[PDB]
Amino acid sequence: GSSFSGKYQLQSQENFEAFMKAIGLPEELIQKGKDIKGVSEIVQNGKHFKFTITAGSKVIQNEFTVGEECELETMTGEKVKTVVQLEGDNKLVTTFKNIKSVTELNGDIITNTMTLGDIVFKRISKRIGT
Template sequence: MAFNGSYELQSQQNFAPFMRAIGLSDDLIEKGNGKESTSEIVEIGDYFKVTVTMGSQVIVNEFVIGQETEIDSPSGEKIKTIIEREGNYRLVAKIQNITSVVEVTGDQLINTMVIGNIVYQRISKRVS
């Protein structure tokens, strides 16, 4: 239940290089950079529902820990993956050539995504 709650994006690092690396156009990167973003996470046992809202774009992903699932990627593709839990406060997924780690530290939700040598990090603060 460590993930339950609403989070607002506070900062992000390497947004543009990461988005270019996954194939987004400069126009889409410019539109997405700096947008306010909120994440709502519902955690019930091993079931998760994650809703990310950026401007008018809403991405909803539902999954069960350890089971193959199809998620919407930042590029808009549907990608199959398995999300694993490491301890109570960390989720890890390998999505094609991207490693994604989401962890709760205090009142922060930290999402770190790595592709090649590019590390993209989003830090959000719990608001409820």
């Protein structure tokens, strides 16, 4: 079971700077990161997921089992204990630090929406071969 598996790169994003400011990302990383089209690699095996996000020289590796407590390293470096759930084959939902994160795969397009209060941080990525 590998619905999400693959490599994807950022096409566009909305509200990057506002959101990164709100969550405590150092401004010098905010200034670098803003026009970076980061790459996400996802390995799904049934309920078990591994995902690696690359944005410049920064590389974050995460894993979780759906339905189970996991520890997710966020943008700042903060590690948060949470549960990631599937809502259908093609949608990953979690909440941490009052942020709602929804990751939806539609064919070759992944849409990631993080909302914290009124701020809706949306990222659209596209599959980039194997």
